[PDB]
Amino acid sequence: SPIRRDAFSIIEAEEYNSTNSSTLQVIGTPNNGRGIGYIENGNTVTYSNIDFGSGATGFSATVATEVNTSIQIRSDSPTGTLLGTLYVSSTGSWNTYNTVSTNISKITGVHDIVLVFSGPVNVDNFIFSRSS
Ligand SMILES: O[C@@H]1[C@@H](O)[C@H](O[C@@H]2CO[C@@H](O[C@@H]3CO[C@@H](O)[C@H](O)[C@H]3O)[C@H](O)[C@H]2O)OC[C@H]1O
Numbered sequence: 586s587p588i589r590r591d592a593f594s595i596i597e598a599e600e601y602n603s604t605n606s607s608t609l610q611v612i613g614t615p616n617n618g619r620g621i622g623y624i625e626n627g628n629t630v631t632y633s634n635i636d637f638g639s640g641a642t643g644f645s646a647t648v649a650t651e652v653n654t655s656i657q658i659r660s661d662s663p664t665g666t667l668l669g670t671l672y673v674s675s676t677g678s679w680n681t682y683n684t685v686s687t688n689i690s691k692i693t694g695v696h697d698i699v700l701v702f703s704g705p706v707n708v709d710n711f712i713f714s715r716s717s
Pocket residue numbers: 612613614615616617621622623624679680705706707
């Protein structure tokens with residue numbers, strides 16, 4: 586998976602750098618893309634060296650789930666700074682993807698990102714939004 590990436594271009598969830606998960610799989614999507622799924626509560630997924638430049642204050646992910654769930658977005662490590670939490674309610678199916686966004690604290694420079702899952706969700710991709 587890429588050693589580094591831009592926060593303001595699409596990051597593919599399936600191109601993660603490490604995970605604690607023993608269940609997570611790379612899945613396909615209806616339009617023949619890929620994502621991550623078979624995720625459980627407590628699973629973490631790390632993406633290395635994301636460059637936030639002069640600042641990001643939002644996070645958007647394209648996700649599908651049948652259960653209400655949340656994803657913490659942390660900087661640097663699973664116990665690093667909580668940037669924000671994306672709350673995802675049911676999208677209607679494991680294959681019905683929806684772009685969902687949340688606010689985060691402003692982050693600058695280069696940091697690993699860790700997504701921390703409280704339950705099952707399929708994630709295709711994500712991206713950050715710049716501060717004003
Ligand atoms: O070709 C694509 C298929 O591979 C794709 O299959 C889906 C893959 O993800 C599955 O989602 C899991 C369902 O079970 C939950 O408990 C897990 O947490 C989910 O990750 C989904 O159910 C499959 O249908 O579908 C799209 C096809 O184009």
